From Swiss-Prot, chains A, B:
Binds 2 Mg(2+) ions per subunit. It is found in: Cytoplasm. This is Farnesyl pyrophosphate synthase. GO terms for biological process: cholesterol biosynthetic process; farnesyl diphosphate biosynthetic process; geranyl diphosphate biosynthetic process. GO terms for cellular component: cytoplasm; cytosol; mitochondrial matrix; nucleoplasm; peroxisome. Mg(2+) 1 binds at D91, D95. Its main location: cytoplasm. The chain holds residues 75 to 415 of 419 of the full protein. Pathway: Isoprenoid biosynthesis; farnesyl diphosphate biosynthesis; farnesyl diphosphate from geranyl diphosphate and isopentenyl diphosphate: step 1/1; Isoprenoid biosynthesis; geranyl diphosphate biosynthesis; geranyl diphosphate from dimethylallyl diphosphate and isopentenyl diphosphate: step 1/1. It catalyses: isopentenyl diphosphate + dimethylallyl diphosphate = (2E)-geranyl diphosphate + diphosphate; isopentenyl diphosphate + (2E)-geranyl diphosphate = (2E,6E)-farnesyl diphosphate + diphosphate. The modification N6-acetyllysine is found at K45, K275. Dimethylallyl diphosphate binds at R100, K188, A189, Q228, K245, K254. Its EC number is 2.5.1.10, 2.5.1.1. The lineage of its organism: Eukaryota, Metazoa, Chordata, Craniata, Vertebrata. Belongs to the FPP/GGPP synthase family.
């Protein structure tokens, strides 16, 4: 479903850049915007943006899937990729990360630095520019603006919770609880990751019912929770040649799923080893935390969690998919699991 | 007009915080949002936010100025103050500034640092939260969302131009031209400063005509240009106990109105003195640039410019105010001149 549709979606990016790139006085700023778009919105798997297009084609009647409607689906897809690019550029600064999508983080590039804050804001502004340029005369225009703005607010509340729970050089393991973890992931990852692209396709298809959006959200928020838990696992146990990024969760004192699982399994001595080595820059201290995680068999605990989560989401698809075609959620589940 | 209306406007901030402050799981994030709002949206002159309220009362018929309409005017006023707070928090980071509104910059506060990037994003999100909570059922709802989003995009293009023209440790005086300066100020300051609050009051009053908005923009963009030129002057020649902020334009290699005026008046020897001392941290080098500016009588050049600008804007009010009451623009001109 995502496979052949990927080519046409990635090919549509050049049009998005052309349409986004009022006198020649702002020429140097438009060139900088092009540079920011090319560096930060290209190189990923495009799964969020592709989900708009795939879901659009499964929800809209083929007679209504005209050339202009497809153009709008691809643009709304790229709007979701731009929301993602805005949050990642800012998150890389705030998490002091080194690489993203197999290249150095935009802010780490010589000559960029903290100018990346405004670049991230420009990426966010491009979304509403594209929605006006392509969807202004559509009946779902306000639904889409409100959806992107709401997704941005919920993600930012999540980021606030993430940063509050991880104060630099302030190790407080008591703060790292299961309830706190579930709250962080729900807001920072679950709304914008899967609910935003499906909801966008739903509004474009004329599906604006409250109960239909609530039912889709019940499946999608659980898939978003799994996705962030997997993200936390891959921060330490993933192959950076596959993830395209270097992990910083232990160094940054994050309330990771791994530290939460460690804490509910650690002995008082193991707890002390974690206490002495967590939230610190020293490679040797980070290695001690990873050693403790491997000793507590957190990779096998995660493998069991992935299996239990998959079955749970599948049970939710059976309960809540109707009247939407279950393929909408199944295609997405196959992509993230 | 602004004087007695200031009290009711500032008193309405506690309501805005209460309405903005969905389970208790995000409680710590809401407390952080309250902290960010109190530190970054309070302490200024509130002229932009007050302009919405003052213009609303002068454009709307008194019979239609009911208790609920006034509540919406105050909220839209505070939305403009929040847009300003979002841009200033990020601009202080990017300009490496020390103080703002008589206190240390939010990002310079111990324990905040680069977390301020997400805080600035939350301030921007609060705008659209308030517009939905108070103006969702109003006929001008979409006009206001589009206005705030457009103002944000234009401001960001301006910031891009500002940062591009000021690369750190890269002194290139040839880039500092009058045409480049006019382009920067137009985008980064003129749209969001005066056009945004008057346009908001205009849409709330049912004034949505293209020609009426274009005529108001012709007056207001010129007032915005003056305001940024005055801002650049006060960066070096203003009293920080009145401005509430320490100047960084010379240290940051900015395309200031002062450097542009210096360049069109400097001898080849004076040009070399500027070349050797501009865009550098050293207090002695900054003092040499200020000495050169004082030698070229840039404070008197600015005083003449303020006089010529005032008369020009007044001539524009005579040409373009109609059918709006000229008091709308006169009250604003008395406040900034
Ligand atoms: O890519 P990362 O950086 O691993 C992340 O998932 C990026 C991200 C950014 C913004 C919102 N949610 C997740 P994080 O939470 O910082 O681990
Ligand atoms: O307050 P400042 O910092 O003097 C400024 O006017 C703040 C500002 C921020 C964003 C957009 N326009 C002006 P700047 O341009 O950096 O001189
Ligand atoms: Mg990160
Ligand atoms: Mg992060
Ligand atoms: Mg991560
Ligand atoms: Mg500044
Ligand atoms: Mg600045
Ligand atoms: Mg300034």
């Amino acid at each position: 479903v995502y496979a052949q549709e990927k080519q046409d979606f990635v090919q549509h990016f050049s049009q998005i850049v052309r349409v986004l790139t009022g006198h020649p006085e702002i020429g140097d700023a438009i060139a900088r915007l092009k540079e920011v778009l090319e560096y930060n919105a290209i190189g990923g798997k495009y799964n969020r943006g592709l989900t708009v297009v795939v879901a659009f084609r499964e929800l809209v009647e083929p007679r209504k899937q005209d050339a202009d409607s497809l153009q709008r689906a691809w643009t709304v897809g790229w709007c979701v990729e731009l929301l993602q690019a805005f949050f990642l550029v800012a998150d890389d600064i705030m998490d002091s990360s080194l690489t993203r999508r197999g290249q150095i983080c935009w802010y780490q590039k010589p000559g960029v630095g903290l100018d990346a804050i405004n670049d991230a804001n420009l990426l966010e502004a491009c979304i509403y520019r594209l929605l006006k340029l392509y969807c202004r005369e559509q009946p779902y225009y306000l639904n889409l603006i409100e959806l992107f703005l709401q997704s941005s607010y919920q993600t930012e509340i999540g980021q606030t919770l993430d940063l509050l729970t991880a104060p630099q050089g302030n190790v407080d393991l008591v703060r790292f609880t299961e309830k706190r973890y579930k709250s962080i992931v729900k807001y920072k990852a679950a709304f914008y990751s899967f609910y935003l692209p499906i909801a966008a396709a739903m509004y474009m298809a004329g599906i604006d019912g409250e109960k239909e959006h609530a039912n889709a959200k019940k499946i999608l928020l659980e898939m978003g929770e799994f996705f962030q838990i997997q993200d936390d696992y891959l921060d330490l146990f993933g192959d950076p040649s596959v993830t395209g990024k270097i992990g910083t969760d232990i160094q940054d004192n994050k309330c990771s799923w791994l530290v939460v699982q460690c804490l509910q399994r650690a002995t008082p001595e193991q707890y002390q080893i974690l206490k002495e080595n967590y939230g610190q820059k020293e490679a040797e201290k980070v290695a001690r935390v990873k050693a403790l995680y491997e000793e507590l068999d957190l990779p096998a605990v995660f493998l069991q969690y992935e299996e239990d989560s998959y079955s749970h989401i599948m049970a939710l698809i059976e309960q809540y998919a109707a009247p939407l075609p279950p393929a909408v959620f199944l295609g997405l589940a196959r992509k993230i699991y």
